[PDB]
Design a protein around this motif. Structure first.
Motif, short mmCIF file in Angstrom:
data_model
loop_
_atom_site.label_atom_id
_atom_site.label_comp_id
_atom_site.label_asym_id
_atom_site.label_seq_id
_atom_site.Cartn_x
_atom_site.Cartn_y
_atom_site.Cartn_z
N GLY A 49 0.46 6.85 -9.57
CA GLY A 49 0.75 8.16 -10.06
C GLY A 49 1.97 8.26 -10.42
N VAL A 50 2.82 7.34 -10.90
CA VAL A 50 4.26 7.55 -11.31
C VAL A 50 4.30 6.77 -12.57
N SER A 51 5.36 6.95 -13.40
CA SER A 51 5.45 6.36 -14.64
C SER A 51 6.06 4.70 -14.71
N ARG A 52 6.22 4.14 -13.54
CA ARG A 52 6.68 2.86 -13.52
C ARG A 52 5.49 1.98 -12.92
N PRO A 53 5.66 0.43 -13.19
CA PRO A 53 4.69 -0.23 -12.71
C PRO A 53 5.05 -0.25 -11.16
N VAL A 54 3.95 -0.49 -10.31
CA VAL A 54 4.15 -0.66 -8.89
C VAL A 54 3.59 -1.96 -8.18
N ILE A 55 4.43 -2.56 -7.52
CA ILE A 55 4.15 -3.82 -7.21
C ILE A 55 3.40 -3.96 -5.88
N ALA A 56 3.77 -3.01 -4.92
CA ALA A 56 2.98 -2.91 -3.75
C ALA A 56 2.86 -1.50 -3.31
N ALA A 57 1.86 -1.09 -2.47
CA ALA A 57 1.71 0.25 -2.02
C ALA A 57 1.12 0.29 -0.68
N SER A 58 1.45 1.06 0.15
CA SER A 58 1.02 1.07 1.76
C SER A 58 0.35 2.35 1.84
N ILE A 59 -1.03 2.42 2.28
CA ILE A 59 -1.76 3.77 2.56
C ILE A 59 -1.33 4.00 3.91
N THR A 60 -0.46 5.22 3.99
CA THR A 60 -0.08 5.61 5.60
C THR A 60 -1.01 6.04 6.45
N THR A 61 -0.79 6.19 7.68
CA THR A 61 -1.72 6.54 8.89
C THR A 61 -2.04 8.17 8.83
N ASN A 62 -3.04 8.50 9.15
CA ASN A 62 -3.18 9.88 9.53
C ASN A 62 -4.56 10.18 10.16
#
Lengths: 119, 415, 68, 152, 60, 225, 51, 121, 64
Positions: free
Chosen positions: H88-101
């Motif tokens: 949900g950003v305008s740039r390409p994203v190379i990696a993403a970490s889903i944080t804990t909850n």
């Protein structure tokens, strides 16, 4: 639903089809005067939208193509002037939640052709 | 010709042949367990129990050219077993890319791709083509029209090589035909009323036969030139021949043989014609044709012994009265049996051991006692037939002919 | 954001103290030990000091049994 | 009446048998050696024993990790050509030098047992070498082939 | 003797008893492991036949 | 401060302020991976039952651990020196460990610690083809397995039929998820000890090492023939 | 071990004592570290050498 | 790219990017490779998604090396563009970490997707 | 075997034979392969095709 034109392709007789987007991947195409179910085209995923392309072939013959998109981004093109069979299957570069496909520059369902040679 | 019996709590769910041209027939079979079992056809024993290295096997299929073997397991794995090492030797090859739900049926396209119907209502397509970049990863996934009020399971999947389709029967009764390239449905038929357990095809794929728990066999035809040039199967015919179910269906078609064979929960076999299914005739086999007997009588004492699985029973004529029985549960599997003339000693015998029991009629009952002989306890027996009241002749499963209570010279046959 | 940085570095201090404190302890094992034997009498008997060798001191805690 | 091809580096060893070729490729259960049975059945026929040269070591290492038709195996085919004798290869994938020219080769299911025997007692009678010397030449070859495959 | 015959049958047949912290399992025999394929997993066989005799298909 | 010995020499328990398990040194002076070093004049490296897998079996109690200070051992699954360092410590400078792995990404530090210890010789080839290192060494006195591949029994069966002398030891560490998830450890470990006694491995003991690893076991056996 | 560190660490990599005193009391962290002596940061002038 | 181990097929990548979109709406993901490695260091990542689409893939394949130390699941999806759309950003994203909850609304979806990930490891 | 109805489509490719037992059978006229349609529980009295030939109207003794 979307309304489009279809040719018999053994006579040069056209008739309108309505195209209903259903649950699984289904597009149910049916006659716009008699309501008879003509054919159905199933894509693999969550069907989200579809559009109708036409391409001319010769004098007075054209061909109807249904272009249906998964939610994920992969697109099926069905030739449906014959039986509703896939002719092309490609993938949208990027795009993960896909809501709406449209064509344009020729006869769409919203710029419709009044005369069959103007398709 | 032959019968290969298994014992207590053993079943068999799938089995496949393998005949590389120039080598012996090979017969693999899964049970309800984690192993594949390859049998040598001579003895009637397992010659190999290859434990597949992932979970409980749900389906088995054999590669085209028959050098590899797919086992589709309960934990969602599809395991390839290298078969071409010779008869008996089986190697692990490759676990294909995993998934959640259990893969309930398998098929191969060619040596290249492997199709699998799973218990989440989906049909995956993996590539088993070695030395490709996408080897083992699942290329496609297709989803059948789910049932409204219960889960859907895809029970049967075949590949149709004349066209380029996959036929698939699932637990709604619907039968779907899928274009392999583009991995997508061409047409769906709403044929059966309940699940479609097994479906098969002929050689040139002009017909697809299908059957399941609603006990009708449906035939889908594409024989017309317009059907072949339009790729349009029609729901041609439908027959009601079976009594309870159809759990297995297969087809053979040659120059002097074209029949589909089907069997189910009712224990009988049914033969129909392939190209003349609806028109022609059919033959429902007897539920048992005792080529290997389970009952014999002795004229003295007017008595009769009969053995089902791992128990024997004896009754006398009079009316009739059950005088004794032997539910020997140290045993696991039974086979053939014989009584002494005068009705003294019974001998029961299976391909692993045999055992001899003295009997004494104590009136309205018998008394039965084991008499120990470790040669009998070690030998494999097919047939025992009692030369005398003491002497019997024993045919071993490894082609030995003893005479006990010792060795018949037996010439060799041209192979 | 700077008091979040303060709490985060305090948390990382305790995280490293936790991991390199638990690296230098020793925890009592609790594993289902299973021994495979012959026909039935070896199973019927007591496994007679086959690896305990005292039934008082060096039997029931397994971090180090001994052979005198 | 047979030979067997056993390697320890660039140093290859075509060791002949003290029994017949059928006796070698038929029973194999009579050794069970402590040392004397392998010492009696053993016969150091040919030892194409090279040195710690990295070129020859890594060349025979690549030919051992691949099919075994190296120049040392051609030397063995030279130094065992008597009457197209029987050979015991180690790996079945060396089929080319197994049956290329006048050598009845056999490697199946008891050849592994006799290789267990002769590999158990390589250093005690086959060379004039010692145990630390065999482990040192093995680790020299191992570090050479490791730094060759795993780049630096 | 009528109320414990299955008890003494199973308690003499079964193996792998406990010994304190331990458990002394019997190894099986090459006899059975080479005469027969292993038994079916009754969980999955019951799953398949219970599915084919679910209530939603009215058997009779 | 007081070092007591274990059932296997080369394995000790340093009691005192922290009653914790420990091995000797064959590396003079230094640690390899930041394990704690205790001196009692004489240098000692702490083993960890969590960082390593054989130490968990020792802490759970392995009586006839065939890794022992008068042998040579074949280690099929280390990938790095974090366990074979302690195996070279316990086998001492008399013998030799053959640490054989396939993935050459941590084989760099494997060869790096094999530079420091001559006890450790590496093999950088996959352990389902032992014929590719036929020509390196044979006739080991105990195999160790730490491969997390599905064909554990077949891989160590091939390695023990090619390189293990008779009546020697087999120690195999079995992860349950690498074979079959969703079914419990008891059935998958019974299945694997039956799969391994299908070969000539008489099973001796299995233990589950539960405070150190989830759903693991260590199975020891003696190689029959 | 330098490659598996995030780029913010590579920014502040030399200035650990200023960093951790400015975190353990709630102050403003440094922005240069060991990377201040690169020629590009030499070419920059102002707050954009932090940038 | 060959050296991008486990790569997801279409169905798994569709549900991975669906849980990425709802975690982005719940402000429960850290998008970018440096923020993913920071969550890997701090141990507050549920699973890591990477893109097998970056033209040096070696700017990625280092967080696998500290994923396999903290036994956190990681997966590859084929498109950095589509991962950026999902985040949900305008740039390409190379990696993403889903944080804990632990009070999260999408905890069940996160757990289902991470189990489907660790099946293929 | 009594036949009470028959119909042909506009190409002459298929033909509907409706029998007095209740069944219908579409024969394909180029190769004489049949397909049975069984719904009518009494005699089939009327058959027709659509223009494209892909729908068959039938009527019988049930008023359906």
């Amino acid at each position: 639903f979307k309304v489009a034109h279809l040719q018999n392709s053994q006579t040069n007789s056209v008739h309108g089809i309505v195209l209903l987007q259903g649950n699984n991947g289904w597009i149910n195409i049916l006659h716009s005067t008699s309501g008879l179910w003509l054919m159905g085209c199933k894509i693999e995923g969550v069907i989200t939208d579809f559009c109708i392309d036409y391409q001319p072939i010769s004098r007075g013959k054209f061909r109807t193509i249904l272009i249906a998109v998964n939610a994920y981004g992969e697109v099926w093109e069905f030739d449906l002037n014959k039986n509703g069979h896939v002719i092309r299957r490609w993938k949208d570069q990027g795009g993960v939640g896909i809501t709406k496909i449209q064509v344009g520059g020729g006869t769409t369902t919203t710029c419709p052709a009044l005369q069959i040679s103007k398709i | 010709e032959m019968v290969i019996e298994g014992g207590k709590d053993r079943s068999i769910e799938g089995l496949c042949w393998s005949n590389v041209n120039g080598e012996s027939l090979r017969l693999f079979s899964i049970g309800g367990s984690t192993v594949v079992t390859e049998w040598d056809l001579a003895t009637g024993l397992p010659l190999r129990n290859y434990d597949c290295n992932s979970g409980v096997i749900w389906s088995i299929s054999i590669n085209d050219s028959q050098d590899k073997l797919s086992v589709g397991c309960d934990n969602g794995t599809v395991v390839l077993i290298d078969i071409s090492g010779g008869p008996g030797v089986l190697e692990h090859d490759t676990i294909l890319m995993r998934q959640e739900a259990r893969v309930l049926t398998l098929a191969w396209k060619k040596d290249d791709f492997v199709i699998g119907g799973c218990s989440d209502g989906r049909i995956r397509i993996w590539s088993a083509q070695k030395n490709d970049e996408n080897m083992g990863r699942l290329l496609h996934t297709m989803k059948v029209d789910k049932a409204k009020k219960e889960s859907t399971l895809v029970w049967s999947v075949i590949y149709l090589p004349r066209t380029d389709q996959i036929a698939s029967g699932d637990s709604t009764g619907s039968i779907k035909f899928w274009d392999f390239q583009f991995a997508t449905l061409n047409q769906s038929f709403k044929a059966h009323d309940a699940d479609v357990l097994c479906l098969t095809t002929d050689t040139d794929n002009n017909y697809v036969f299908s059957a399941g728990v609603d006990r009708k066999i449906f035939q889908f035809s594409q024989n017309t030139n317009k059907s072949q040039k339009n790729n349009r199967w029609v729901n041609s015919s439908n027959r009601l021949l079976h009594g309870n179910d159809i759990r297995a269906i297969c087809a053979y078609q040659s120059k002097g043989a074209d029949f589909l064979v089907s069997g189910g929960v009712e224990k009988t076999l049914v033969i129909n014609s392939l190209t003349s299914f609806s028109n022609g005739n059919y033959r429902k086999m007897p539920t048992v044709e005792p080529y290997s007997k389970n009952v014999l009588v002795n004229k003295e004492q007017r008595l009769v012994v009969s053995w089902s699985e791992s128990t024997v029973k004896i009754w006398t004529m009079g009316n009739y009265k059950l005088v004794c029985k032997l539910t020997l549960k140290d045993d696991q599997n039974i086979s053939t049996c014989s009584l002494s003339p005068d009705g003294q000693v019974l001998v029961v015998g299976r391909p692993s051991t045999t055992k001899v029991f003295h009997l004494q009629p104590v009136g309205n009952k018998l008394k039965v006692t084991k008499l120990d002989n470790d040669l009998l306890l070690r030998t494999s027996t097919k047939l025992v037939k009692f030369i005398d009241n003491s002497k019997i002749v024993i045919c071993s499963c490894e082609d030995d002919v003893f005479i006990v209570d010792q060795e018949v010279e037996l010439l060799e046959v041209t192979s | 954001t700077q008091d979040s940085n303060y709490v985060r570095t305090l948390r990382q201090i305790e995280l490293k103290k936790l991991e390199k404190g638990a690296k230098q302890l020793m925890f009592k094992s609790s594993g289902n030990h299973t021994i495979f034997v012959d026909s039935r009498e070896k199973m019927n008997e007591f496994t007679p000091e086959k690896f305990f060798n005292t039934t008082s001191e060096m039997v029931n805690r397994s971090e180090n049994r001994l052979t005198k | 009446y047979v030979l067997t091809e056993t390697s320890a580096g660039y140093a290859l060893l075509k060791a002949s048998d003290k029994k017949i070729y059928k006796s070698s490729s038929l029973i194999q259960d009579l050794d069970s050696s402590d040392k004397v049975l392998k010492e009696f059945k053993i016969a150091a026929f040919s030892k194409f024993n090279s040195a710690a040269n990295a070129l020859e070591e890594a060349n025979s290492i690549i030919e051992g990790k691949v099919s075994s038709q190296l120049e040392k195996l051609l030397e063995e085919i030279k130094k065992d050509k008597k009457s197209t004798l029987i050979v015991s290869e180690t790996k079945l994938a060396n089929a080319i030098n197994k049956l290329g020219l006048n050598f009845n080769v056999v490697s199946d299911a008891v050849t592994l047992d006799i290789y267990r025997a002769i590999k158990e007692y390589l250093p005690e009678l086959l060379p004039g070498m010692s145990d630390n010397d065999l482990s040192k030449m093995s680790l020299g070859l191992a570090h050479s082939i490791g730094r060759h495959k795993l780049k630096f | 003797i009528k109320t414990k015959k299955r008890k003494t049958l199973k308690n003499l047949r079964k193996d792998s008893v406990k010994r304190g912290k331990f458990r002394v399992q019997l190894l099986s025999t090459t006899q059975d492991s080479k005469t027969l394929p292993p038994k079916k997993e009754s969980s999955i066989i019951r799953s398949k036949d219970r599915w084919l005799n679910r209530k939603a298909l009215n058997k009779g | 401060v007081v070092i007591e010995p274990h059932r296997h020499a080369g394995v000790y328990i340093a009691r005192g302020k922290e009653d914790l398990l420990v091995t000797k040194n064959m590396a003079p002076g230094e640690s390899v991976y930041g394990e704690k070093r205790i001196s009692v004049k004489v240098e000692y490296r702490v083993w960890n039952p969590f960082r390593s897998k054989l130490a968990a079996g020792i802490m759970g109690g392995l009586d006839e651990l065939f890794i022992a200070p008068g042998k040579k051992v074949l280690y099929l699954g280390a990938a790095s020196g974090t366990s074979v360092s302690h195996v070279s410590d316990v086998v001492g400078p008399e013998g030799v460990v053959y640490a054989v792995e396939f993935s050459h990404r941590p084989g760099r530090e494997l060869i790096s610690m094999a530079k420091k210890r001559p006890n450790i010789i590496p093999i950088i080839e996959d352990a389902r083809h032992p014929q590719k290192y036929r020509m390196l060494i044979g006739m080991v006195d105990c195999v160790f397995a730490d491969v997390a591949q599905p064909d554990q029994a077949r891989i160590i069966a091939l390695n023990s039929h090619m390189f293990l002398k008779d009546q020697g030891g087999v120690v195999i560490s079995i992860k349950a998820n690498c074979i079959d998830s969703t079914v419990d450890a008891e059935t998958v470990f019974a299945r694997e000890v039956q799969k391994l006694r299908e070969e000539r491995i008489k099973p001796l003991e299995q233990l589950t090492l539960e405070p150190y690893e989830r759903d693991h076991c260590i199975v020891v056996g003696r190689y029959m023939r | 071990s330098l490659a598996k560190s995030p780029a913010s660490t590579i920014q502040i990599l030399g200035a650990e004592k200023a960093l951790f005193r400015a975190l353990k009391t709630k102050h403003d962290t440094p922005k240069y570290g060991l990377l201040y002596h690169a020629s590009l940061v030499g070419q920059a002038t102002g707050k954009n050498k932090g940038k | 790219n060959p050296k991008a181990f486990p790569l997801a097929d279409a169905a798994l990548t569709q549900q991975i990017l669906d849980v990425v979109q709802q975690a982005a709406n719940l402000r429960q993901l850290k998008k970018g490779a440096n923020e993913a490695t920071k969550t890997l260091n701090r141990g507050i990542s549920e699973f890591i998604i990477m893109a097998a689409d970056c033209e040096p893939i070696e700017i990625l394949l280092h967080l696998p090396l500290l994923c396999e130390d903290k036994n956190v699941p990681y997966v590859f999806v084929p498109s950095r563009v589509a991962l950026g759309r999902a985040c949900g950003v305008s740039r390409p994203v190379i990696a993403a970490s889903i944080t804990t909850n632990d009070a999260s609304a999408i905890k069940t979806q996160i757990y289902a997707v991470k189990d489907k990930i660790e099946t293929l490891l | 075997r009594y036949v009470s109805s028959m119909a042909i489509d506009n190409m002459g490719q298929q033909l509907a034979v409706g029998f007095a037992s209740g069944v219908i059978s579409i024969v394909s006229l180029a190769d004489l392969q049949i397909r049975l349609l069984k719904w009518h529980i009494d005699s089939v009295l009327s058959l027709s095709f659509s223009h494209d030939g892909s729908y068959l109207l039938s009527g019988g003794w049930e008023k359906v």
